[model samples]
Target chain A: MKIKQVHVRASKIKLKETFTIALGTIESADSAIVEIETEEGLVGYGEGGPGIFITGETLAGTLETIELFGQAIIGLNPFNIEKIHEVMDKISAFAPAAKAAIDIACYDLMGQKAQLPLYQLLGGYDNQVITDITLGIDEPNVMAQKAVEKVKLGFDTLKIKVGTGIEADIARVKAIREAVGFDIKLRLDANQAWTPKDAVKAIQALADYQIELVEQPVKRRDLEGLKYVTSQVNTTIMADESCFDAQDALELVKKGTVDVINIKLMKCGGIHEALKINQICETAGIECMIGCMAEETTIGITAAAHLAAAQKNITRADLDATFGLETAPVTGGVSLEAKPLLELGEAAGLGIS
Target chain B: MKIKQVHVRASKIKLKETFTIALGTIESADSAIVEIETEEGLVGYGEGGPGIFITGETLAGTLETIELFGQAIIGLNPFNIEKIHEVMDKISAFAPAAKAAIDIACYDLMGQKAQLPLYQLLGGYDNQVITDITLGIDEPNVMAQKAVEKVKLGFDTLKIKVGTGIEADIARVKAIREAVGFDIKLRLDANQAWTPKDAVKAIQALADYQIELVEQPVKRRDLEGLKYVTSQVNTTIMADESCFDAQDALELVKKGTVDVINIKLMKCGGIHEALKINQICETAGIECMIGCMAEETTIGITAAAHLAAAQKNITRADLDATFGLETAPVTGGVSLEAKPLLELGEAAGLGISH
Candidate 1:
């Protein structure tokens, strides 16, 4: 079926607290949601929230790109995935966020056209994927409390944002691990805040915490630094900011600088690029973690979920849309009701409302 | 001066023609340009066109992010660059374009605040950067014509996008070199489209053309392929798409996979990440080439120019915004008037207009 309409909207969901990092901090969350309705009344939804510090996109830029340039995507067959990419590339010089939303929407529409679930559309659906909860930077007690609370909420994996202050970072990790006891998986994302030396010291101290992984412990530029930290630390080193695309993954694997890769849609662009990244990780035999950005609603999360479920190589899934439960009212579209942990039913294209 | 407003605009500028590659093709151009205006009438600009193929950010998402969450940044003091980043971080979630825009804008404002040009602010105003004119995938004759035209325009360096087909790719390079008749630097970006064996044959054949470098001759994941290509080719092999952040560069250098690096802001995320990539290139002593995405305007180009100019370690500059001259009118306070080469003037924060 031919495409019909593409609409974009901007919304803000206030956060409970400021998320602080070494480079900077963030306050309220913003999102640009794109909804495409086909000629046959098949509707697909896509949402994107570009982190200014991360991807270089802003809320206004995303909205305008969708409203203006994304309009050309109308009338094209949503099932023509290649054509959708063509349109994206046509306007890619504008902003990746605009094209990405349309791409996600087109993927959703394709899933609808095929009359299959998004996961199946991408590949196949599996129930083994586990969701990880992310804890923002905060005080030691508060951070520990959040970690304990996450564990209590049935989240076995937790990623904490650190690298603000070395002393505070150490205290927070210690407090959280002590409170959570031992079985829970702990991951830390320094976001390129620490220097190589600081990363080594901090990671060395946290070795006793049974940390699962440390992401971007030093700056993204320090490949040697990363290698140094990896050699010094027993904890698995995952590259987040350090790994931007498939090429990045290859380099990391070749150097043996990192043990895991945190693949986020924003970083990889979309499912297509994500697939390439998966291939890179699989070929290298490195553990891949499907991660997400904050302010993601069910729309973006659903797209990620399908990919994470279908990709057999993924070690852990960080599809934490459930954390946004309070931010956006979850409608009756896809529910995490059954086994395999938050499965979107066999509906077409992400199964989102 | 107190910060007055941070206005971000996302626009699509049409390309004169489609840019084709083995992976895909690009028809129109998309970019998210952010303008940070202070109450004192001082303004700074930043743009993010990170490969949508890699980063999932779209223009719409970037715009909405700026309007909804970025509005909070309008009233803040532009001089408080770190504080503005703090505010951006609080509201940002997985939007690198948003962060980069603010970061670059802050840098631009910082330059303006200090009454310095962006390149000077980044410690790069002292050097002149050469632009590498890119040749898209086209017929041999057409590619040759483009190369000759570029050379006539006074560009000493030309990078041809190859790897669509082995024979066609070889013919295109050979034709360009023949048409240019030597004295011009020639580089090629396979964009990870070639198989190692094919890359070997192609590079060997093109070696007679005095080819300076070949980038990403094989699939990025194919380190073995890269190594093979590197070994087989007489020309120095550069890693473009294969080298993302600094670690990626190190890997290629350590494994002896490639000889040069092509760093771009879109792939690295921002200057902060780009700096990391530069550091890796520096330590490895691998030749570094600072490249740009297709949709970059003055904001992003200025930032990259400063980096390339300031860092003596960077061997080549591949800033190609001048190619988009036919697309749209360059406005929003930044203008690059020099035809083939533009000097990063002594303005603050990317040399953009307020």
Candidate 2:
């Protein structure tokens, strides 16, 4: 079916916690939701969870991009995705979050048209995936307490956000390790905070604590630094901010800079490109983790969870971004209330109405 | 929705021309059609166009295999394709044509449920693909006349069957090249009829005719022979009878045996495995041609056409099997009457209804 109309609206989401990372801190999320309606009356939903620090797009930019893309894609068939992508990508080169908004909407429409869940249409790897809740950068004792509480609440893994200081990061992990009692998996995300030498030193000091992986430890452009950290430390190094599109994934895998690549729809321009990245990674024998911005909404979380569930190589997920939100703007997607396991229902598309 | 019932029936098809390859000759086609009905009453159709020489399946074997797979998959969701394939595969291993029937039915249901044409759901690379018509082995003058007629009728490419004798094969190709001129692409299929040394000699002798490619020059089991011919020839060598599944494609590619792989759903067990083979080939920088057995029916031809159209790596198509059929059993799928091009309509699934 051809797209009849497109609507872009802003969603201001207030979180239960002030999410803090090495890059910045935020108490509220600005989500640009793009709703595309087909001529046959079927509707598809997409969310642009743009982070100035992560995807390099603001809500204003995402909205404008969607407007231009929506106008360009009118009277185009959703099933012709490659053509649609070409049309959207030709209008603007940057603003992946904006393109992701349109791309996801098209995927949802395709799934809806196919009368299958998005996961099934993608690959149907699984319907459920376990996720690790991220503990934002905090005081060591406070972070340790949060880690224990999450574990007690049925979380098998916790992602510890660090990068403020080497000593502070060590203390944070040490406290969490002592509190969680070595049974739980602890992942660290530096979010591009340390140099190669500093990251190596900090990660080596905390090596005994058994960090599952350290994410974006060096700058986004520091390919050499990432490779160095990956070489120096025993911990698995993952590229989050450094890898965005399929080209980035190919570079990362070919360079052997990181053990895992983090895929976010907003950063990589949605499921179309994400599949390419995952395929490249799968071919290279490298694994990937589906990550989301800390202030992500239900739409973003559900889309990410479907992708995480669809592929075999995407073994890890940091989909806890929606956990702290007081309420979801829409229903019928994935339910994260089942603790560590994110469950998708039998509804078509992303299942979000 | 879950499957409610499955019915397997046989269709006997008469051909306009007697079809022949290096393996055998056939005047009639035996097809086993598999129809799957969901609880909601949405029906999906699949066809098992088996060739004893190509897919190692008989009509009787295909019927029994589909019956078992149909019963095994009852009450299962069509979208759970991996689970369904595992269920069907656990029952029988050799009857790829039978498994293809079930796999294709499931894919058809998936497309119907998604309200999209099968090509769109598969990859939607393109909706239209140019197909090459095959001219079976015959008298050199007769085959040349047929080639000239086909080109005049708008076919851009011709696959000339040549496997009986090296001198006769050279003569057949030479006749066609002279008659059809240099503009029309000519592909040769030895169909495992030639020895490695004989194939090299014949191919090298015919190299000046600008034959596009040669398919299955050596025997199926002789991987080394195939590799030898591939190494010895400047023209592209494609493996048809020698390659069946993804693993076979992988071996052929890793061993550097063939330049291109010919994929048939009946031989490879349908689109799921065919997709894997195509993906592996695409990743290895190898191109693929979607081909069908002689005496293939409309159902098999349409399904193969969708797959041929869905991927970029599947750059060539030998989808002319249905052209010789006296009449099709169903309607609303792909129209092959438009010679040189196969066209698929907007209907979902294979869009076939008796």
Candidate 3:
């Protein structure tokens, strides 16, 4: 069916608490929601939660981009994914998050039309994924308490935000490890904060705490620096900010620098391009984690969850953004319980209702 | 449906004459043939023509690889292209041509089950493609006459084999250009015959010939050297042996070196992987050419033609291998007319007649 019209609306998702990373802090998510309609009355929904630090897009720009792309895609067949991407890419090379919203909506329509779940359409791997709740950067004691609370609420893993400073970062992990009793998995995200030398030293010093992996220890541009840190540290390093699409993943895979890559739909355009990124990583025998922006709505989080469930190489999930939201703006997507597990419903497409 | 059995056979197709390139010369094509069958009795056909100079596969090794991979995919669904590739890759990372035969057979089976031609199942962009005939390396006068004969036969474009030496290579193109005049499209294939510096020097020296592009001037492993030639010369540099899959295409695209890529199903595994390669180039605003192995059959050539017709980025074709063969092994595949145009039939799958 040809796309009739596309709708773009501004959204604000209130967070349970202030989310802090090396990039900055945000109290709420400024999101752009998209709805694509066909002349035959089928509809699809999508969300874009862009961060200037991660996706290089702001809320206002994302909305405008959706409108512009919406006009360009009218009267085009949604099933022609390759052509749609080429058309969108021709208009603007950037605006990955904006493009992702349209892409996700089209895929949602594809699954709905096929009468299959998006996961099955992608690759029927698994339906359930265990996630790690993230703790924002704070005082050592405060971060430890949040880690313990997350464990009490059934989180088996914790992603601790660090990169404020080397000593304080170490203290944040140290306090949380002692409080949570070493059974819980601990991962760290610096979010491109530390220098290469300091990243190596900090990771080496935190060996006692048993970190599962460190994300973006150094800046994204410093490939050699990322390589240096990966060489010196015993912990696995994941590329978050450094990798945006399949092309970037191949560069990292060829360089043999990072142990893992973080796939975000907003950053990589959408499920179509993320599929490529995961394929490259999978071919290289590298594992990936499906990550999310803190301001993301359940629509975006659920879409990300479907991709994680569909692939074999995606071994981990940082899709705790749904947990951070006070109320989900959409219905019948992926379910986030009090526990750290993400569950996919057995419905067509992304199962959005 | 689950795959029931896979069959591998050995065949040899004699060429019209000794086909010469920069690497060496050959008289016949050493090929591996594969047919995959389902329990319900549907079957598909594929061919793998490997050369040590190109795909790094010998006929005997490819036969054994097909047998090994054939056993690996016994109970899997044919439509699960990703899983099939993953399973084959786990068995052996090399043997791309062997994997291609199996992959092609599976795709043929997929299109047959869906009752669509492989091209339509791929992208349905077009049903026809124009191909350029290739002239092998030879003396200047000999190659010039061959180019003239090909032009008279309605082939508007000719890929001239060169790289024996800087001066001789120039003489071959110069002689052909004057013989055919300036209207026909003339491309060159060095086949990894020149150093980075020499390639730039020769390509620059051939400026008066109005060449379309040059393929693989430097060695495959030398990325910086390829970049140097691309920067020094005005003619578009196309990577043939240098790019085998999407990963290599991305490396070239990101480095901004080559103007075009040459995709051969035998080297890249099959249409599935080739689709990814073309997609990467298309996104980067780079064009591509669909080239073929000297030893390939119409089964492989038809499969390659379907890909060339299916994508927007693949703007050119070097699928003239069928022309070298004296007779067709199978019927009802792509019809390679004498006029240098490839035509696809309206039948399901690859349309190979048993």
lDDT of 2: 0.85
Model with the higher TM-score, candidate 1 or 2: 2
Candidate 2 lDDT tens digits, B112-191:
88777899987776887889999998999999989878888899999999988999989999998989799899999999
Location of the lowest summed lDDT over 10 successive residues in candidate 1 chain B: B329-338
lDDT of 3: 0.85
The DockQ-based CAPRI class assigned to model 1 is incorrect
Evaluate residue B144 in candidate 2 and report its C-alpha lDDT on the 0 to 100 scale. 93
lDDT of each: 0.71, 0.85, 0.85
Candidate 2 accuracy as TM-score:
0.80
- The per-candidate TM-score of the B chain, in the order shown, comes to 0.87, 0.98, 0.98
TM-score of chain A of each: 0.91, 0.98, 0.98
Per-residue lDDT over B1-354 for candidate 1, one digit per residue giving the tens place of the 0 to 100 score:
566776777667777667775556776667788777777787677787745664566778777776664578666655444355456657874666667766677667766655555554333324457777788888999999987777888989888888778888888888888898889989888888788888888788876689888888888789988989888866888887777655576567667877778888766556644655665555455768888777666677777777777665576888876466454434433244424575765544565563
Candidate 2 CAPRI grade = incorrect
- After superposition, the stretches of candidate 1 with alpha carbons farther than 4 Å from their true spots are A333-340, B1-354
Q: Write the per-residue lDDT of candidate 1 for residues A223-320, one digit (tens) a residue.
A: 99988888987788888888866567767877788888888876666775576566556546687888776656667777787788776667687776
